[PDB]
């Protein structure tokens, strides 16, 4: 190849690349190791990954990493060639391989050549499928050619092409790690203006890029393409004026860093199918009271997220998660989110009903991918709110395959938490009893965080924080309204401050800051919600 | 102009249109700048949105917003010709592109020329998919061939052709902004007369346009078509008097503002997709009872839509909807129906049984389409009547797919309403208890409107309003019967006045205006629906 | 393999392989025998059991011992197709069989291709059943179109497909026996370097082997593959030393025992309907306290299970089970788990409440499924926790079907016990009296092991063992708290030591070897759990 692509080009994948090195690259260099000792290396290998990683470019750099003769044919063009001018291609490349060994047979998107499992029937489809299949069979298990390929998905070929001994060693390459992304974007920075070497800009760009959880290799490259374009807008008022182009601009293109950030705004980062909320901004300060809980929540979360290691030095075994239980949505969701904000750790909130209506086709594989995605996005806190909803008592009869498929997959996936994994499960539920106790058994949830309903003192604190948006009148006395009744939860008090506005807008035709009277009327509008019957329910349920 | 369209002739899409200009037109003019500093051009753009509604016209005006060869071919005829000669058809045009490049290759319906990845297969289909794939590869750095195209839907394409470096640039062009819409409709006004110079009429057309719920380019133009028709009605019993076209009126015809006003509805130009069941006709004044509720319910729907701004001076909150719950028999639907007539925003109604039977072949996709369509058609009020019927308890176990399919989709879709969105949920149920408590969790119904049964004082107003139609004798004492019993519901007092008539018609076959006696007998024919025991059920149920 | 896996290559299936051998293989060798004497063997054969284990390998070796043309079709792809094209697939293969006959037609998951006996809810379902039926009917003997089929569910297939002729012969195989694994792993060992031909390695391979009692021939083989891979890592920094293979290591690499061990973590060969239970690892010696119970329980379980032989010479039939009973969770499960640790046998735990509530419209089928799941997965020891929960007294007036459904099914299924399996029924309960005494009658629980809660003296032992991992200041003595108090249960004292850690880690942000005070604060956080009231109850109830 004319422009040989060293590791450093697709670099930042080094973790994953070390797999590749040790897996496919070694036999491709000298098979003698595996040939002499242990199982024969598979000569068909697929690099599987979430669609795109600059698909081709990944394996194109593995080709030249081994330095093996970069024989390329690609799926679109494999079936482009005429009937029986397709057939001679394959054989020609393979023969050219056998001569030039090490030779990396690089065929990509082999899903495109052989798609449907058996719903393919095509003339050429069986011809070329067979040819490659047979070209795989014909081999010398010392003839230094391997066949690398890519696909977007494991199921995306004929089972014949998966058949053991014919494409079967498997390598997953996902979304690049935050620092790794820098390397990639750095390589693309070589073309780009930044104006100077600016290790500082590089560091800025580093955290700039971390401002998004990710973009894939291709997508990263689009971010940079955007910057250029976007920055060319900045220079659109200056340049246009000079109808014949000036070469004075040759260093009057120096992208302004804010351009990158502004391109970052609107570029639809990544292309992930499922929602991936990052870390919310809700500070501990924004929580409605519960200073005590904060001290405890910090030590509960922080020990697992921040420092597993030192506990193994003692010899104690940390927990495997926790559940929140108490009066429904006291800003439950806010408590969880809060702890996650202050922790750098990504938060994932995938709503309990969402997953229960979401399946990969009435099939639990979506949940198994949820945990997978969580593992991948780690350090992170997966949050399942209404965990009851995703796993009620297995005695529920609405469930049929719900329990078999998903609840048990959930079970094993919750068990899937490991000390090495950075995931932490913050479950939250309104009524525990509804939930399947297997999730409350050892090896899963361990503690149930009771939330006392809003105290008089805490009403004040939820109130100051909430009314931060609203303008208050000199007339207001905030501690008064708190003291008027503790009879509310946080969620209604949200609406309380709101409802004050609703009343108020009627009162003052054009709005003027909420007043004691505006609060009073609204106080008597909302019904109390802190049932002394339910507090006792949880009080007694605190035994369990 | 009409022949020889250019953006300035008709656009009004300017934010979006500005994308097109700045994207493909900019490099195409002076590439020397961008070639040297920054990005190389893209090679394909797909225009996603409401179909051929401006899609074509955009590129049709890139025939004068350019002058680069507007090589026009369209998908249906591209793939037809004498099997296996079809592929060379495409290619011939591509070659003819390179010669005449700068050339704007204009192909539309890149679904007909873009099947699904593997889901769709077909000889010609896979043939042409590959060809186009290779035609994308055929693009050179030197190249100056640009490809614009349109398709029915985003997902209708082959993701391979989506994959960057193959139709890398993608532009979705949405429903036009309120302020933008004015431009569109104004420009389309050019041929027809209005009033005088009337910046005021232009401004009327502006606010007219915010009075229009949002109309796509076509729909806006349909207003213009209507006006023609409507104003021609005015001239209808004048013009067809003789065989030649009159000159006494030929531009001494006048298209008055009122034509527009009658067009504004009453020909429902929000034909923005999907079937929307026909309107009633009643306005809140014409409905009686629950004046208080009316004042708030009105304020819930009207306030954001009619005046977002004054509520923002206080500070807005979401107000995603409300549920109506109480004793049935005020005609739940009638309260709802009232608001929907009067509301400026479009109303969306998907009646419970319809959606609940939309499991054709097991396709929950329909509920998922409701919200999707709602989002697109926003600002709007979606209406769910007997929401229980579409979403009972998720503890139901008579389900096949029933909970999984629809109910859980409902969940995720209700969460799917965003604060920025103008979609609002007007729920109705007779019995809350039947619906899953998760829906009675906040943010999946912001406030819960208890309907207390009609007060005596309100009975007077509902009753008077209802008997307004009836011929009424002076023998009546309407406030008397109102004051006699609150035991009726609204449905009953309707029937009270009805049954009175029945008594009366029997009594005097010859017409007589209804009398007190006609009310008395009927008073004892109908009976109180209301049972304070049942009121107590709902009264207690107001704490979920 | 190269020369396909010969009959003699596979083994440990000797009971079964000898069946096949003696059945289809004999005529295929010399037909002359059967040609002279009576009818020739049939075509259909069913392999019942957990799959892929040897399913394939059986028929993969038929070829080497009969010259049959191994030809396959597999369940997923048979049923993929479109209507009326599913049928022709099979038939096409049958004709292709006849050409190449003798042909060992090998079909797997034949449940999937004939999923329902009469309860078919599909076209294709009825299609393929008929085809296969007809594929049996056309019959050619001379062309030995021998068709072996396999399934994971014995009775899934239509009785028609099991008919005399039409798969008359059925031969069941399952997860290998302990000794059988050795054979299997031994044959697979010939291709790799153990570290010496050494009888010791064979013996090592034996105790290595007991960790599965023989789970899946394929899985076993993957385990060895893991070792290889792992060992190639060990020599990876050494193969890094030289690209041309050294003569020092030209495969004078040794696959060290630690490799085997390191594969042992993370390969999970427990795959037989992986529900099972997680592996216990606390031998009875590692079990704290209750030295007395251990001594008696050990001789009770171990004598029949570990030494079947000495029991058979007597001729006394093994126990039908036993009960463990004591105060709520002393780590009841740990006693059970213990029994399972020392035994090779798989452990099964299905909790009493969990099974009992599956009353999804009322469906006892779950209790009935327990035993079913157990019976198949045997050798295993079932533990049922809270026998009270699955069986109360039947004398209460709140019983209807409660007793009939579960308790008697439980009853009949417990009697259903097979002593020709490694099942041992270990019941556990809070209060014995609560259960119906019939389960305490013979044919079920034979003896009743009262588990008196731990003593102070046992507290001494539990405390040291548990904190064995944890570090400890030499100035602080454990025996101080042990001799001090004991109300605390053992399961709680577990958490005591845990919580001690939590407190201590809280104290110093740097590691410590805990203080007495660090134990104290948590000591009083936990409450006592030996109510002298319940102990006297059980003590007196020992006279029941």
Please identify among residues 317-356 of chain A the ones whose CB lies closer than 8 Å to any CB of chain C.
Answer: 317
CA dist C114 and C522 (Å) reads 61
CA C423-C429-C431 angle, 5° bins: 145
Shared domain check, C512 and C389 = no
Residue B192: CB atoms within 10 A of its CB come to 15
A22, A118, A399 ranked by CB distance to C77: nearest: A118
Dihedral sign of CA atoms C236, C238, C241, C246 in order: negative
Render C130-178 in DSSP notation, one character per residue.
HHHHHHHHT--TTTTEEEEEEESSTTTS-HHHHSSSTT-EEEE--SPPH
DSSP 8-state symbol, B154: G
Residue C27: CB atoms within 10 A of its CB come to 18
The answer as to whether B543 is a domain residue is no
Dihedral sign of CA atoms C305, C311, C312, C315 in order: negative
Residue B203: CB atoms within 10 A of its CB come to 11
Closest by Cα among B431, B398, B388, B442 to B541? B431
CA distances from A21 to A171, A174, B326 (A): 11, 17, 69
Beta strand C103-106 with C322-325: parallel, antiparallel or unpaired?
A: unpaired
Contact at CB, C511 and A314, closer than 8 angstroms: yes
CA distances from B523 to B485, B519, B526, B527 (A): 9, 6, 6, 7
Shared domain check, C342 and C479 = no
Contact at CB, B395 and A396, closer than 8 angstroms: yes
CA distances from C74 to A106, B443, C219, C271 (A): 30, 50, 20, 21
**Phi, psi (rounded to 5 degrees) for B411:** -50, -65
Enumerate neighbours of A (3 or more CB pairs within 8 A). B, C
Q: Say what the alpha-carbon torsion angle C433, C435, C438, C444 is, to the nearest 10 degrees.
A: -110
Side-by-side strand order, sheet with B447-450: B346-349, B380-384, B423-427, B321-325, B447-450
The answer as to whether C540 is a domain residue is no
Shared domain check, A316 and A240 = no
Task: Name B125's Cβ contacts closer than 8 Å, sequence gap at least 6.
Answer: B79, B115
Contact at CB, A317 and C498, closer than 8 angstroms: yes
3-state secondary structure of B48: strand
Render A484-538 in DSSP notation, one character per residue.
T-----HHHHHHHHHHHHHHHHHHSSS---B-HHHHHHHHTTSPP---HHHHHHH
The answer as to whether C314 is a domain residue is yes
DSSP 8-state symbol, A440: G
List, in sequence order, the alpha helices (H) in A418-489: 456-466, 478-482
Under 8 Å between Cβ of B453 and B490: no
The tokens describing C435, both together, are 């259960």
C244, C363, C470 ranked by CB distance to A314: nearest: C470
Distance from CA of B219 to the nearest CA of A (A): 29
Please identify among residues 367-406 of chain C the ones whose CB lies closer than 8 Å to any CB of chain A.
Answer: none
CATH of the domain at C298: 3.40.50.300
Shared domain check, A159 and A12 = yes
Beta strand B103-106 with A447-450: parallel, antiparallel or unpaired?
A: unpaired
Under 8 Å between Cβ of B322 and B447: yes
Please identify among residues 219-238 of chain B the ones whose CB lies closer than 8 Å to any CB of chain A.
Answer: none
CA dist A218 and B165 (Å) reads 9
Under 8 Å between Cβ of B442 and B544: no
- A501: which chain B residues are within 8 Å (Cβ-Cβ)? 311, 314-315, 317
CA dist B479 and B487 (Å) reads 15
The tokens describing B93, both together, are 């045009």
Dihedral sign of CA atoms B88, B93, B98, B100 in order: positive
Cα radius of gyration rounded to whole Å, chain C: 29
Q: Say what the alpha-carbon torsion angle C36, C39, C44, C46 is, to the nearest 10 degrees.
A: -90
C229, C236, C243 ranked by CB distance to A30: nearest: C243
Please identify among residues 155-214 of chain A the ones whose CB lies closer than 8 Å to any CB of chain B.
Answer: 156, 192-193
- A268: which chain B residues are within 8 Å (Cβ-Cβ)? none
Closest by Cα among B103, B100, B120 to B161? B120
3-state secondary structure of C241: coil
CA dist A277 and A361 (Å) reads 23
Which of A75, A333, A357 to mutate to test binding with chain B, by most B CBs within 10 Å of its CB?
A357
Q: Is C266 on the interface with A (CB under 8 A)?
A: no
C239, C363, C506 ranked by CB distance to A299: nearest: C506
Render B66-124 in DSSP notation, one character per residue.
--SEEEE--HHHHTTSTTTSHHHHHHHHHHHHHHH-SEEEE---TTTT---SSSS--HH
3-state secondary structure of C332: helix
Task: Name B389's Cβ contacts closer than 8 Å, sequence gap at least 6.
Answer: B352, B353, B356
Please identify among residues 46-75 of chain C the ones whose CB lies closer than 8 Å to any CB of chain A.
Answer: 74
The tokens describing C330, both together, are 């002393």
The answer as to whether A538 is a domain residue is no
Under 8 Å between Cβ of A416 and A369: no
3-state secondary structure of B17: helix
Shared domain check, C493 and C435 = no
Side-by-side strand order, sheet with B171-172: B69-72, B103-106, B145-150, B45-48, B171-172
Q: Which region holds residue A326: left if phi is over 0, alpha if psi is between -120 and 50, else beta?
A: left
Shared domain check, A290 and A186 = no
CA distances from A522 to A502, B322, B449, C389 (A): 9, 17, 15, 50
Of A387, A421, A450, the position where a domain reaches its end is A450
Total count of domains within chain B: 4
Cis peptide before A379 (omega within 30 of 0): yes
Distance from CA of A38 to the nearest CA of C (A): 5
The tokens describing B351, both together, are 């009646």
- B543: which chain A residues are within 8 Å (Cβ-Cβ)? 527, 529, 531
Contact at CB, A316 and C514, closer than 8 angstroms: no
CA distances from C19 to B374, C13, C15, C162, C169 (A): 67, 9, 6, 18, 10
DSSP 8-state symbol, B269: -
Q: Is C365 on the interface with A (CB under 8 A)?
A: no
Annotated binding site of B for ATP: 49-56, 326-333
Shared domain check, A345 and A430 = yes
Under 8 Å between Cβ of C405 and C363: no
Residue C50: CB atoms within 10 A of its CB come to 18
Shared domain check, B156 and B18 = yes
The tokens describing C218, both together, are 């394929």
Shared domain check, C293 and C185 = no
CA distances from A27 to A1, A36, A142, C224 (A): 22, 11, 9, 19
- What are the start-end ranges of the E strands in B120-229? 145-150, 171-172
CA C56-C61-C64 angle, 5° bins: 150
The answer as to whether B386 is a domain residue is yes
Closest by Cα among C114, C149, C117, C155 to C372? C155
Task: Name A238's Cβ contacts closer than 8 Å, sequence gap at least 6.
Answer: A252
- B37: which chain A residues are within 8 Å (Cβ-Cβ)? 193, 228, 249-250, 253
Of C450, C469, C495, the position where a domain reaches its end is C450
Residue A73: CB atoms within 10 A of its CB come to 17
CA dist B531 and B487 (Å) reads 8
Under 8 Å between Cβ of A143 and A69: no
CA distances from A87 to A78, A84, A90, A129 (A): 9, 5, 6, 10
Render B278-306 in DSSP notation, one character per residue.
PP----GGGS-S-HHHHHHHHHHHHHHHH
The answer as to whether C196 is a domain residue is yes
Q: Is A218 on the interface with B (CB under 8 A)?
A: yes
CA dist B385 and B332 (Å) reads 8
A51, A192, A511 ranked by CB distance to B314: nearest: A511
List, in sequence order, the alpha helices (H) in C416-489: 456-466, 479-484
Task: Name B298's Cβ contacts closer than 8 Å, sequence gap at least 6.
Answer: B284, B339
SS3 of A203-226: the string is: HHHHHHHHCCCCCCHHHHHHHHHH
The answer as to whether A279 is a domain residue is no
Q: Is A524 annotated as a binding residue?
A: no
DSSP 8-state symbol, C466: H
How was this structure determined? It was done by: cryo-EM
CA B526-B527-B531 angle, 5° bins: 155
Under 8 Å between Cβ of C242 and C211: no
Shared domain check, B515 and B443 = no
- B39: which chain A residues are within 8 Å (Cβ-Cβ)? 225, 228-229
Closest by Cα among C269, C262, C265 to C209? C269
Task: Name C74's Cβ contacts closer than 8 Å, sequence gap at least 6.
Answer: A159, C107, C108, C109
Helices C178-189 & C199-209 angle (0-180, nearest 10): 130
- C351: which chain A residues are within 8 Å (Cβ-Cβ)? 438
Under 8 Å between Cβ of B248 and B262: no
Q: Is A329 annotated as a binding residue?
A: yes
Q: Is A331 annotated as a binding residue?
A: yes
Q: How many CB pairs below 8 A link A and B?
A: 155
Task: Name A372's Cβ contacts closer than 8 Å, sequence gap at least 6.
Answer: none
CA dist A287 and A289 (Å) reads 6
The answer as to whether A269 is a domain residue is no
Contact at CB, A437 and C353, closer than 8 angstroms: yes
CA distances from C63 to C41, C57, C68, C69, C167 (A): 17, 10, 5, 6, 20
CA C310-C412-C544 angle, 5° bins: 75
Q: Is B112 on the interface with A (CB under 8 A)?
A: no
CA C114-C119-C123 angle, 5° bins: 60
The tokens describing A319, both together, are 């927990």
Q: List A323's β-bridge partners, or say none.
A: A448
Which residue bears the tokens 């346009």?
B209
Distance from CA of B408 to the nearest CA of A (A): 4
Which residue bears the tokens 């405390």?
C463
Contact at CB, A232 and B137, closer than 8 angstroms: no
3-state secondary structure of A47: strand
Which of A498, A506, A508 to mutate to test binding with chain B, by most B CBs within 10 Å of its CB?
A498
Distance from CA of C491 to the nearest CA of A (A): 12
Shared domain check, C384 and C255 = no
Under 8 Å between Cβ of B320 and B295: no
Which residue bears the tokens 């304070």?
B532
Q: Is A303 on the interface with C (CB under 8 A)?
A: yes
Which of A297, A299, A314, A396 to mutate to test binding with chain C, by most C CBs within 10 Å of its CB?
A314
**Phi, psi (rounded to 5 degrees) for C38:** 50, 180
Q: Is A330 annotated as a binding residue?
A: yes
CA dist C58 and C232 (Å) reads 31
Residue B24 buriedness (CB in 10 A; 0-12 / 13-18 / 19+): buried
- A31: which chain C residues are within 8 Å (Cβ-Cβ)? none
Shared domain check, B415 and B371 = yes
Q: Is B30 on the interface with A (CB under 8 A)?
A: yes
Q: Is A485 annotated as a binding residue?
A: no
Residue of A nearest to B407 (CA): A357
Residue of A nearest to C349 (CA): A438
Which of C330, C502, C509 to mutate to test binding with chain A, by most A CBs within 10 Å of its CB?
C502
Task: Name B354's Cβ contacts closer than 8 Å, sequence gap at least 6.
Answer: none
Distance from CA of C324 to the nearest CA of A (A): 20
Q: A223 lies in which domain range?
A: 178-264
Contact at CB, B163 and A506, closer than 8 angstroms: no
Q: Is A313 on the interface with C (CB under 8 A)?
A: yes
C245, C469, C471 ranked by CB distance to A33: nearest: C245
Of C415, C450, C485, the position where a domain reaches its end is C450
CATH of the domain at B210: 1.10.8.60
A22, A30, A395 ranked by CB distance to C359: nearest: A395
Element (H, E) at A375: helix A365-377
Task: Name C103's Cβ contacts closer than 8 Å, sequence gap at least 6.
Answer: C68, C69, C70, C71, C97, C143, C144, C145, C146
Q: List C325's β-bridge partners, or say none.
A: C429, C450
CA dist B513 and B504 (Å) reads 8
Closest by Cα among A467, A460, A393 to A433? A393
The tokens describing A178, both together, are 């935050």
Task: Name B537's Cβ contacts closer than 8 Å, sequence gap at least 6.
Answer: none
């Amino acid at each position: 190849e004319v422009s040989r692509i060293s590791y450093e080009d697709i670099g930042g994948l080094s973790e994953q690349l070390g797999k590749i090195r040790e897996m496919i690259e070694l036999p491709l260099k000298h098979p003698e190791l595996f040939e002499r000792l242990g199982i024969t290396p598979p000569k068909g290998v697929i690099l599987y990954g979430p669609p795109g990683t600059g698909k081709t470019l990944i394996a194109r750099a593995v080709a030249n990493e081994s330095g093996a003769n970069f024989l390329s044919i690609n799926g679109p063009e494999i079936m482009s060639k005429y009937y029986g001018q397709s057939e001679q291609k394959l054989r020609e490349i393979f023969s050219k391989a056998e001569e030039t060994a090490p030779s990396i047979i690089f065929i990509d998107e082999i899903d495109s050549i052989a798609p449907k499992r058996e719903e393919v029937q095509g003339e050429v489809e069986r011809r070329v499928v067979a040819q490659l299949l047979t070209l795989m069979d014909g081999m010398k298990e010392r003839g230094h050619v391997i066949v690398i390929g890519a696909t977007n998905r494991i199921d995306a070929i004929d089972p014949a092409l998966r058949r053991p001994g014919r494409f079967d060693r498997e390598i997953e390459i996902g979304v690049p790690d935050r620092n790794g992304r820098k390397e990639i974007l750095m390589i693309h920075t070589r073309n780009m203006p930044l104006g100077m070497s600016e290790e500082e800009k590089n560091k800025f760009l580093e955290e700039m890029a971390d401002y998004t959880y990710g973009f894939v290799g291709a997508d990263l490259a689009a971010l940079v393409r955007e910057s250029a374009m976007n920055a060319l807008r900045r220079y659109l008022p200056e340049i246009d004026l000079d109808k014949p182009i000036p070469t004075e601009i040759l260093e009057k293109m120096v992208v302004t860093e804010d351009d990158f950030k502004n391109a970052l705004k609107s570029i639809e980062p990544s292309s992930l199918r499922e929602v991936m909320v990052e870390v919310p901004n809700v500070h501990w300060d924004d929580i409605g009271g519960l200073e005590d809980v904060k001290r405890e929540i910090k030590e509960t979360v922080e020990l697992p997220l921040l420092k597993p290691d030192v506990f193994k030095r003692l010899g104690i075994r940390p927990s495997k998660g926790f559940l929140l239980y108490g009066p429904p949505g006291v800003g439950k969701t806010l408590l969880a989110k809060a702890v996650a904000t202050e922790s750098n750790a990504n938060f994932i909130s995938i709503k309990g009903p969402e997953v229960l209506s979401k399946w990969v086709g009435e099939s639990e594989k979506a949940i198994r991918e949820i945990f997978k995605k969580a593992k991948q996005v780690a350090p992170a806190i997966v949050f399942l709110d209404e965990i009851d909803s995703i796993a009620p008592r297995r005695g529920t009869t609405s469930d049929s395959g719900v329990t078999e498929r998903i609840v048990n997959q959930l079970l094993t996936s919750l068990d899937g938490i490991e000390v090495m994994n950075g995931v932490v499960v913050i479950g939250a539920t309104n009524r525990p009893d509804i939930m399947d106790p297997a999730l409350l058994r050892a090896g899963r949830f361990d503690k149930l965080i009771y939330i006392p309903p809003p105290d008089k003192e805490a009403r004040l604190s939820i109130l100051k924080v909430h009314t931060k948006n609203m303008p208050l009148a000199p007339d207001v006395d905030l501690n008064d309204i708190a003291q008027r009744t503790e009879g509310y939860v946080g969620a209604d008090l949200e609406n309380l401050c709101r409802e004050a506005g609703m009343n108020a807008y009627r009162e003052n035709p054009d709005a003027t800051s909420v007043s004691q009277k505006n609060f009073l009327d609204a106080l008597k509008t909302i019904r109390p919600s802190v049932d002394e019957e339910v507090i006792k329910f949880y009080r007694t349920l605190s035994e369990t």
